[PDB]
Design a binder for this molecule. Structure first.
Ligand SMILES: *CCC(=O)Nc1cccc(Nc2nc3c(-c4ccccc4)cccn3n2)c1
Length: 300
């Protein structure tokens, strides 16, 4: 329906999962004549691991890289909607279907309606591949589990990958972090999820705006004009502390919209929000993934 645009370079770490998804998804689409007869792409791939390890984000990256294929990102949030889901799949080949939080399935009447998904997997399906993703792979019943013949564990990020993701979640916003800073944020965040890092920087991003909304004084300052970044101007105002040279008793209401110079995102800012959040994952939840990682292996 709509095409994602995530490049390989943008996803941090996950080098192992990239090589397997290249071997299982991308290389067969670009080179169909290699996968003939005995070898054809697996019917469905299952991504499992701790929450916020990039499983869903990795699904968008693999969808962007085939380009020839089409991306149908259906949510975990009705059999005629999936009958046409596979019907529109087979008309446009090659194609892939990502089902985030596929632990959805597996007490209730909706339980009965869950059978419509397995009809399609085993009809003619060649250019269609189903990406499954979940954080609790064990609750999944055996009928779908035997259907994803390839299962990939997405691990917690490594220090280099966490340092990257602190830089990536910043984007183009004004900050004063050095490359040596990002590396230091990697070491201090051991066991932190990918979602956990995204939580930290959004709070750190909100401290400039909080400083503006709370400042009782502003100081005139030089800087690039908000109309043209190439022309330095002098009438800009930035939050100051009540005693700095040039303090003016005024709040953000008295600052014109085009005269505010935003304060930069510090490193102490990011450390201040790092200290206020702790890793979501626990050691118990991971060894339960260890239980799944060995009981069934790849297709058992
Ligand atoms: C090239 C532009 C771009 O895509 N930047 C960007 C911004 C945020 C994150 C990433 N890559 C990335 N995200 C993750 C996660 C993750 C983050 C947030 C929430 C859930 C998961 C986990 C693991 C790896 N990873 N890379 C790129």
């Amino acid at each position: 329906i709509e095409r994602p645009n995530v490049k390989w370079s943008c996803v941090a770490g996950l080098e192992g999962a990239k090589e397997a998804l290249k071997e299982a998804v991308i290389l067969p689409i670009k080179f169909p004549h290699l996968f003939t007869g005995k070898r054809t792409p697996w019917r469905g791939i299952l991504l499992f691991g701790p929450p916020g390890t990039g499983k869903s984000y990795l699904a968008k990256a693999v969808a962007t890289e085939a380009n020839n294929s089409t991306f149908f990102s259906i949510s975990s949030s009705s059999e005629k909607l999936v009958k046409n889901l596979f019907q529109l799949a087979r008309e446009n080949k090659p194609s892939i279907i990502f089902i985030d939080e596929i632990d959805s399935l597996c007490s209730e009447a909706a339980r009965r309606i869950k059978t419509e998904f397995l009809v399609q997997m085993q009809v003619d399906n060649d250019g269609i591949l189903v990406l499954g993703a979940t954080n609790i792979p064990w609750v999944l019943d055996s009928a779908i589990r035997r259907r994803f013949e390839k299962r990939i564990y997405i691990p917690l990020p490594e220090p280099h990958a966490r340092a990257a993701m602190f830089k990536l979640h910043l984007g183009t916003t004004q900050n004063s972090l050095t490359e040596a800073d990002f590396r230091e944020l990697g070491r201090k965040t051991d066991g932190y999820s990918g979602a956990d890092i995204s939580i930290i920087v959004r709070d750190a991003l909100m401290q400039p705006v909080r400083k503006v909304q709370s400042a009782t004084h502003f100081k005139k300052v030089r800087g690039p004009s908000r109309a043209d970044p190439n022309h330095l101007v002098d009438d800009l105002l930035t939050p100051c502390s009540p005693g700095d040279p040039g303090a003016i008793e005024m709040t953000w209401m008295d600052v014109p919209g085009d005269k505010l110079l935003e304060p930069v995102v510090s490193m102490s800012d990011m450390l201040r929000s790092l200290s206020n959040t702790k890793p979501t994952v626990n050691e118990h939840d991971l060894l339960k993934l260890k239980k799944f990682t060995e009981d069934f292996g790849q297709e058992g």
